[PDB]
Amino acid sequence: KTTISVIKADIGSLAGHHIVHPDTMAAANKVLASAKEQGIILDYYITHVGDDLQLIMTHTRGELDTKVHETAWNAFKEAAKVAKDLGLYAAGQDLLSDSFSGNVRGLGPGVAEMEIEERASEPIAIFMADKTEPGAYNLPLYKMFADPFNTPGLVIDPTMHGGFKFEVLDVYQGEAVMLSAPQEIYDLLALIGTPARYVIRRVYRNEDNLLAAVVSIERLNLIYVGKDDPVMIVRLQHGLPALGEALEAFAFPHLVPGWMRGSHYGPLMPVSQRDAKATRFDGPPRLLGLGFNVKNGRLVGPTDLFDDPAFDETRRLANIVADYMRRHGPFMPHRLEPTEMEYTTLPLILEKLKDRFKK
Amino acid sequence: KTTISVIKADIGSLAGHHIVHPDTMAAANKVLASAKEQGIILDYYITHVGDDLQLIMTHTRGELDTKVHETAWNAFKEAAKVAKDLGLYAAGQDLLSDSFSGNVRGLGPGVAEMEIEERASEPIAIFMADKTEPGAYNLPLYKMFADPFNTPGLVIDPTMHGGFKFEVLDVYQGEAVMLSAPQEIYDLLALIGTPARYVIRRVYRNEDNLLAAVVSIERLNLIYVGKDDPVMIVRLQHGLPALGEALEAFAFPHLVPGWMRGSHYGPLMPVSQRDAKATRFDGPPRLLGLGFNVKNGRLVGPTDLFDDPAFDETRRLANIVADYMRRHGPFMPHRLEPTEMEYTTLPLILEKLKDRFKK
Amino acid sequence: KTTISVIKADIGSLAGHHIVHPDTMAAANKVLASAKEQGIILDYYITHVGDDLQLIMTHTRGELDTKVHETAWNAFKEAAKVAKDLGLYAAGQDLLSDSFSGNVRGLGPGVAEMEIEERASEPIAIFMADKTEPGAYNLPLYKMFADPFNTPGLVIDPTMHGGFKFEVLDVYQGEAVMLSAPQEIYDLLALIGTPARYVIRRVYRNEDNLLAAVVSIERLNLIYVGKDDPVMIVRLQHGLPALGEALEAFAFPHLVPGWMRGSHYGPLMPVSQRDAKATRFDGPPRLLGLGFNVKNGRLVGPTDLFDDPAFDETRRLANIVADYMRRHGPFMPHRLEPTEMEYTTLPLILEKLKDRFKK
Amino acid sequence: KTTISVIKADIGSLAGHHIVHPDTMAAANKVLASAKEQGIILDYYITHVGDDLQLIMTHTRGELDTKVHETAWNAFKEAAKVAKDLGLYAAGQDLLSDSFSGNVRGLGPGVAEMEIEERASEPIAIFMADKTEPGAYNLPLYKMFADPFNTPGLVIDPTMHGGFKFEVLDVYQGEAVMLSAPQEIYDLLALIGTPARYVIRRVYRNEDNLLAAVVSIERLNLIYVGKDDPVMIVRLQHGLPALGEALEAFAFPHLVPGWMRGSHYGPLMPVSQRDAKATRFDGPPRLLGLGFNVKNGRLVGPTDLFDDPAFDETRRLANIVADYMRRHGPFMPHRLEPTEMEYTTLPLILEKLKDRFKK
Amino acid sequence: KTTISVIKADIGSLAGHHIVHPDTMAAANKVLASAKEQGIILDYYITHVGDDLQLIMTHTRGELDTKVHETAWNAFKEAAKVAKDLGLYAAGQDLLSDSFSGNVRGLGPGVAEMEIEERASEPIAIFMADKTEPGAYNLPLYKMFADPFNTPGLVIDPTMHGGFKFEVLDVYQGEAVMLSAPQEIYDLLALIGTPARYVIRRVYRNEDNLLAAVVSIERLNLIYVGKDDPVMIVRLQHGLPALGEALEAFAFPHLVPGWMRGSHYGPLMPVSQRDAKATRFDGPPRLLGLGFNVKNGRLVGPTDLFDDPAFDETRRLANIVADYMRRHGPFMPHRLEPTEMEYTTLPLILEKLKDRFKK
Numbered sequence A, B, C, D, E: 001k002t003t004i005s006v007i008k009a010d011i012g013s014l015a016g017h018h019i020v021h022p023d024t025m026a027a028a029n030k031v032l033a034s035a036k037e038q039g040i041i042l043d044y045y046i047t048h049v050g051d052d053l054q055l056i057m058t059h060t061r062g063e064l065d066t067k068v069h070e071t072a073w074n075a076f077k078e079a080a081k082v083a084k085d086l087g088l089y090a091a092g093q094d095l096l097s098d099s100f101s102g103n104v105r106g107l108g109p110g111v112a113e114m115e116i117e118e119r120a121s122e123p124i125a126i127f128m129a130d131k132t133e134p135g136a137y138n139l140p141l142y143k144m145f146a147d148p149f150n151t152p153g154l155v156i157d158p159t160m161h162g163g164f165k166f167e168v169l170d171v172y173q174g175e176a177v178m179l180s181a182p183q184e185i186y187d188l189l190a191l192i193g194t195p196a197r198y199v200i201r202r203v204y205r206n207e208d209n210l211l212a213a214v215v216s217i218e219r220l221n222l223i224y225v226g227k228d229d230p231v232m233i234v235r236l237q238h239g240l241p242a243l244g245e246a247l248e249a250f251a252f253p254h255l256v257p258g259w260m261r262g263s264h265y266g267p268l269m270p271v272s273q274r275d276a277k278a279t280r281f282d283g284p285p286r287l288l289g290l291g292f293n294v295k296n297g298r299l300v301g302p303t304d305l306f307d308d309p310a311f312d313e314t315r316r317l318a319n320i321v322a323d324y325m326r327r328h329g330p331f332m333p334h335r336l337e338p339t340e341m342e343y344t345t346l347p348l349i350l351e352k353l354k355d356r357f358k359k
Ligand SMILES: O=C(COP(=O)(O)O)[C@@H](O)[C@H](O)[C@H](O)COP(=O)(O)O
Pocket: A010, A016, A017, A050, A051, A093, A100, A101, A102, A103, A130, A131, A228, A229, A259, A260, A261, A262, A281, A282, E236, E237, E238, E239, E240, E242, E243, E244
């Protein structure tokens, strides 16, 4: 029984909400190195995507474990202290509600965890994104596990003919429903087509209920606000989507909510580790993909999945679409709908014009 | 005192919500020919864009005139009768609530009217669109009358330095506010950036309050539903935007709400009269632009504005963007937000899954 | 009760298997004009696509009617006589087994027929192609009636939520199976993905079994040979795919079997009536689409569906892909698999090299 | 007398059928280092392409030598043991019939060998590919040795005017025929145009029967299955194709069988060593090319042939074509013909629908 | 109270006005290392863009400090001495009026300085350009601080609704005016649209007069000549433009004056540090952008802002536009207007043709 835990948080960044400073990751490493030595975790890999510090850990303490999460929290705290000493922007952003930044602060780390029984070989792909929200994975997951034009295994691999089912979470009501594909795909799409309300949290294979994927998503809180910059774990091969079928689902840089000030739609841009930073208009939204093999709680890898020429046109299209969207300025659909904007002056404007509006 | 009235309505179309059949326009012509002979109207031009029959009329009976509107209604009725006899699809669509079609029916004709005092020369541009809504003109109008990067006259023509003001209608509350540019552009944009709620209905020059533009838009009704496929009249030159500045505002094929089943965002495609028909995915949304000179109530013209090579790249970009958007399938932002979809199965789906949703 | 019958045949063409000569269609018109006068048929429209003369007829004699088919045969015979007198190439090609041409001759006319009860309004799209086979419509039909990324109505139109079922014909065994979507789409695709063996012949709406589409396809004959250059009739709107959803299925110029010497894969190119002729490499395969409204057995229209700018990029991509495929020369996958080639020298080659092959 | 032996095998890979892990190659190196020390082989170079570990060895033990092959087998075994300890996917794939993977396992290493008499200078190019089959080299070889539009030497170099002959193997019958170019090129093409049945195994210069090229291909076995991911050795210059003429044959990224689940056609993408890994849709198929000079059994080099800007457009075209092919989903010609698919559910589907098929 | 001082100067370059030689920067480093040790400055970063050596220094001695500037001068002097010993071109260019070069020499170092009170976190972006003049920043700054289509914060961030004001310097008259946005943007643009006469020197936030940006620009001198190759400091976040909004203003490679012989208009090309050198036609003009965080007088960073894929299309467009402009040869608008050309032969030509000109 092995648990793969991907916990991330924004603890500050250089020159804006741009990139995680190496020194902060070094601080996080000392903490996890100790946790590994103490036997709390079996292995780990630390990296970043944009201004989000990523903690990939394997252990045998199951999902939602207090000690693993506390270990992650201490890692972020130590990283935040370095960020503060370095005077980085938004130091401790996701940890302190009063940190120095203008976006939603102090919501805590985002998490994607799956406790599983390692198969003979356990290949997995971990995706981490910056400048977007959990619903960003709805389209990719649907394609990976239900679209026969994306995953031919559904049609030509006997072991996958049974299909997969999706656990869809209503982030507002805090309730989840299980929909099976293929016969409920029209129902499924009617829901997940609205990423701000319905998000795929987990995916299971129909034939044996094997857990195949998990997304970092939790119901909204009224302070309605929720965490962003999602992570996802996808189990691959042998009856589950091949690495290539999972990657095929990201070949199209679809428009996702987020980007600048968490108030726009922009193309998801799959990038290499070195290109995992937010620049133009605080983006475009960046997607990092790392492949691993989990062996007895150990992390073999990673292999940088999108750092390959097969995604060069995906990135070029992302840049072209980014320019096109930007020519819309503050107009929908480039700007998000009123209630979904992380930043807004509408309430203040209407207040100022209350007596100027005529019947 | 001359009134320019553009009244349009869908009275049926060939092979779907594709194109207005010539025979139906011929019927409408007989009616307006009689009205002109009777002196009700001074002149007129009939055409179409997609499945919307357009009645461009000039007269001296002012805005919201019962006889002019009744004349228009009779023209549409006669056209609808021919559509019915020809077995066209959605015959009498906008006139009968029970016409044969699946979209919103019987809401009545859309109207854009402006009563003015003809200047020495009165050049105007009339824009008519199919497969989108009134808010589609928000971005173009803002550019035409407030964006110095679109209309250099605002910066280099002394007669335009004073700027323009916009009458913005809250289509839900049924109230309008006047915002002046330049000093209130940030306030203006905070509103019109949401085309489904705030729509520019009229534009005036600040220095003398001269009416410069009018858009077909009326507050929503609860049956919240409203008319679509908008028309707009823009007065040009001599202190008002040049024809070229008005056309510059459409050089960028921005994403507008509508397209297939009035439930998607798609690029507005400026087209010639011959290309004014909906095809791929019932679009892309089509924009027809006609230039005229109004002289003593007479309509000199028209000149097909977008039927020119200067817009060939605009159309190519529209086709490229159309393909890109379509790869999103039933997912936002290609699909509209839940409450804005003209068609939806969500209510029925949630009802069906009410007991399957778990807390 | 109205029957729409599309019957086509190659009766000769100018300068090769290039285009139908106007004089031959004039001869066919005299025959149908008489049939209409005699009351055999209620209406008709004659045209062509490549070297295939098209007879679109509406009547009340049901499917597979001897008199209607005999009328069609006489129309083709008269056209063939003119073709012969004009010395056209392959005169009487599909009517005479010994006509002057090197391809498969004398198989008879291809047919697509559907007897229906006209709805309040009966909009339809008729597709006719040259230089390909019936299976060419498998991908488009699957998209039109089962792919939610093509036809959003399946997801957002309550009247279509029930889905559609496909009658798939095994052209070799002469047996057909009914598969329903959505829950059998993986099974369906496993079959129709092989257009040379499994072809969608008809499509029905699940909720009420309404016939929605028909394709010209008949089981193979051993002389295993079958007819090519297929036609298809698709009923549109009001619970059935919108014209735009049917056209969306052809926005992608997919590779289809046929083209030069019926032995290659080439992109299906949607074209206007004037561009419906085979040129480069006897293609690329051409697709003509005509929209009509059927009213009391009468044909209102047609409207040339693909003669629109929304398909300009589709055609450009077809040309680009055509060049790419051609660089493969006589190699698969540009050349068809051995048993599917209409022309082949393999048997003769192996015979010549029987003693040169060493164990 | 020197023998160049290229022996490759899949012994496991990281995160899927993605890439060979460095540790496994290190294990293989220890084995060959010992073999070299023992005098079994004179020199070697180890690398990979996708999930295939490559052993390039030079020795004086001739073709099909038991000790050289046994040495290769031990190298793979040691690599497989490391792969197993690292928990890599498909550990020992090509060595064990029951290894953990869903594709064809335990068929053994693929081999391309040529025993020759070194010329004054012996320049050679070695090509290794992943995600395709031996027939993939048919088109390139034909161009290199018979197409005057590829190799001008055939027309302007007196020493090459005599031409070359091809040993074509019928992989099903297990028999080979020798065809000479130029006078038998139409016969040759009639055969090699079908890569799944006829594969060029060796190429000889007509004038002196000098062996010029060898491809890894063996007759099929009934367990009809065969090995994939082919290698090829081509001798260059001085009467044989120049390095540039051999590379010219790969400038066009032709469609080859394989890619995802060995059941699709995809463009062959020539890549540098660092880009020799399978990603999008488990590809596109990757081609590694290494140039060497063989001097007294020693391997001087290599030079990474495709890691050069002259192939940047080749790769871009491969990416563009890859996207185009993928839009076909599970449909031919993107999906392979029924009998050529490595994975299939057809047998099971027909069994399930046996009673639903109607006569 | 911390002062950020960016002082640059051309002290010689390799192979032309191409690039700063590393040895010269090493000499400059020794000088600043000493100044830091002596406490004159708190921190520094030295780099280059084209042939301009950049000295980024932080200290507490305020703007226009004699000792800081003298320190900079000594740094340049030591660098110039190395340049001279290395025989570099234009050694001491900006320091000596008689240095070996044909352009304007001995004008002295260019400077951009801002004394501020560090905010909780002080993220900044420093831009340095070669082959253009100060006015090059007019368009970018206008967009960053006044264009709602560039900086959505102006519309959706309450803390920025108040807008910004610009200090515009008349470089000829030596007088500056303060214009506020939004209500004076048309006036502002009427001026800054002429970069050779009106240059934005500083930018302030309207609500609290916080200094947000500074540009290196000084009034012209009659020897009318002025310095070129400008630098700019922009304060970011928390009520000021986000890093992404500042970078968005450079996404469009606008035409700027300078390039070859300071007499042409060419596209501003944002580049990485390694690409910060002038090549084709002594350009195109290069823009280096570095992000830092200032903490207690210390410089944390930098992060190379434009060395990211999000600007790849910006650079490609720059190359395309560069070629287009170059086809104009010595004709305006590629060549600058007569009085703005750094090099000219016009005076001599007119003198030579004085008697050949006929009335
Ligand atoms: O979305 C963003 C960062 O979100 P995270 O990636 O940190 O969640 C950015 O776009 C910020 O909203 C923008 O820089 C303004 O930040 P602020 O000046 O108000 O502090």
